[PDB]
Structure 1
Amino acid sequence: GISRDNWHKRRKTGGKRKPYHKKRKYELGRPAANTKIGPRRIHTVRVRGGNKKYRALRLDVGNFSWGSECCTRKTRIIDVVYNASNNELVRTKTLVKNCIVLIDSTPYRQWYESHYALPLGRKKGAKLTPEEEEILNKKRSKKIQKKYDERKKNAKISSLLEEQFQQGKLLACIASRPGQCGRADGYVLEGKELEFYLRKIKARKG
């Protein structure tokens, strides 16, 4: 089948190599997983040594870590916005190891209010009062308020992440390899990497 051998290639000098054996099993290849976005679909394949590999054919959720805030949440992937290897992968919305995607910012927002007690992503407020009124006040005691206003001082978020939270979608880079582990873990883009990828997307379109 698909072979991963080295003896089908030309020599470094450019000469043609002649195979001294037919294709062996251990030097095989398998078709690409081509992980798309959709309801979960994972196929188990048996690999060398009897071990197991997960072809994620379709994925919709993944575990992404903020990093700066050390907040790691299982969120939902919306779509793929950029891919360094191929633009066709972006067009087909294929999830690969290094493609950057749009993920839901809802769990990170909720953790931000539950940990810092600051609005994030809200425009004018007074829209979810039966829940956010509890979290703004908490009618808490002196020691708890001392902890919270101790944590208020370093509650600064970059304007880029703030705009993304206003839009409701963060953009994050995958780190795992779907089609090998069957999942789409990753990390939220922030800082100079975020600026670089934003400029790349803007140059691509707009």
Structure 2
Amino acid sequence: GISRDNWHKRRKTGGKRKPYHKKRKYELGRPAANTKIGPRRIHTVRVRGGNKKYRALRLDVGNFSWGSECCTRKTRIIDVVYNASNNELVRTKTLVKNCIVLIDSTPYRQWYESHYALPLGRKEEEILNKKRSKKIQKKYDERKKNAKISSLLEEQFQQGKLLACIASRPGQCGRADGYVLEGKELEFYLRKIKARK
């Protein structure tokens, strides 16, 4: 079938090489997963060594990392906004290893409001304006010092949508994990999205 041999290539000199064997099985390739967004549908492939790799055909839920607090939650993927490899993978909503996605921010607002007692992306009362005992209220005041998120990243929490990045290989591992874009890597991809608009 789909072969990923080297001997169908021409040589370095440009000489056409003649095949010396039939195409062997350890040179096989399989079709691409083309993982979309939707209710979870995963197929398993029996591979060499009797092992199994999980290829996902539809995924809506991922595991992304906030990075600068080591806060990783299991959130939900909204859609794909950027792909450096192919523009037309954005329009068909395909999830690949480096594509820039857009996720729901409510597990990251909720953890932040519990770890700092400070509203994030707000224009119930119990976790924020709680009556704390003064030893406990002391502890939240040195966390209050370093509670400032950058201005590009507080914009995201108001629309409830974080701009994120895939890091795993969906269609090999069957998952979609990654990290939240922040810092100069954020504003690099922000103006690429603005330029396409």
Q: TM-score range by the shorter chain?
A: over 0.9
- Secondary structure of the structure 1 residue equivalent to 2:44: strand
Moved over 4 A (4+): none
Q: Which residue matches 1:163?
A: 155
Q: Which has the higher helix share?
A: 1
| In structure 1, C-alpha distance between the alignment counterparts of 2:82 and 2:130, rounded to whole Å | 42
| In structure 2, C-alpha distance between the alignment counterparts of 1:203 and 1:159, rounded to whole Å | 20
**What do residues 35-72 of structure 1 show as CA deviations (whole Å, max 9, x unaligned)?**
00000000010001000011100000000000011100
| In structure 2, C-alpha distance between the alignment counterparts of 1:186 and 1:75, rounded to whole Å | 11
Q: Structure 2: which 5+ residue stretches go unaligned?
A: none
**What do residues 69-108 of structure 1 show as CA deviations (whole Å, max 9, x unaligned)?**
1100000000000000001100100000000100000000
- Secondary structure of the structure 1 residue equivalent to 2:2: coil
Q: Which residue matches 1:112?
A: 112
- Secondary structure of the structure 1 residue equivalent to 2:126: helix
Aligned length: 197
Q: Structure 1: which 5+ residue stretches go unaligned?
A: 123-130
**What do residues 87-145 of structure 1 show as CA deviations (whole Å, max 9, x unaligned)?**
110010000000010000000000000001000111xxxxxxxx922112321111101
| Percent of residue pairs bearing the same amino acid type | 99
| In structure 1, C-alpha distance between the alignment counterparts of 2:156 and 2:180, rounded to whole Å | 11
Name the stretch that deviates more: 151-160 or 135-144: 135-144
| In structure 2, C-alpha distance between the alignment counterparts of 1:195 and 1:11, rounded to whole Å | 43
Q: Which residue matches 1:193?
A: 185
2:163/2:180 contact within 8 Å kept: yes
| In structure 1, C-alpha distance between the alignment counterparts of 2:6 and 2:128, rounded to whole Å | 64
Q: Which residue matches 1:179?
A: 171
| In structure 1, C-alpha distance between the alignment counterparts of 2:151 and 2:89, rounded to whole Å | 29
2:114/2:128 contact within 8 Å kept: no
2:64/2:75 contact within 8 Å kept: yes
| In structure 2, C-alpha distance between the alignment counterparts of 1:198 and 1:184, rounded to whole Å | 21
| In structure 2, C-alpha distance between the alignment counterparts of 1:107 and 1:13, rounded to whole Å | 57
CA RMSD of aligned residues (A): 1.3
| In structure 1, C-alpha distance between the alignment counterparts of 2:180 and 2:71, rounded to whole Å | 10
2:40/2:58 contact within 8 Å kept: yes
1:176: Cα distance to partner? 0.2
| In structure 2, C-alpha distance between the alignment counterparts of 1:105 and 1:91, rounded to whole Å | 23
- Secondary structure of the structure 1 residue equivalent to 2:128: helix
| In structure 1, C-alpha distance between the alignment counterparts of 2:10 and 2:162, rounded to whole Å | 46
1:195: Cα distance to partner? 0.3
Q: Which residue matches 2:91?
A: 91
**What do residues 23-46 of structure 1 show as CA deviations (whole Å, max 9, x unaligned)?**
000010000000000000000100
| In structure 1, C-alpha distance between the alignment counterparts of 2:170 and 2:128, rounded to whole Å | 40
Q: TM-score, normalised by structure 2?
A: 0.98
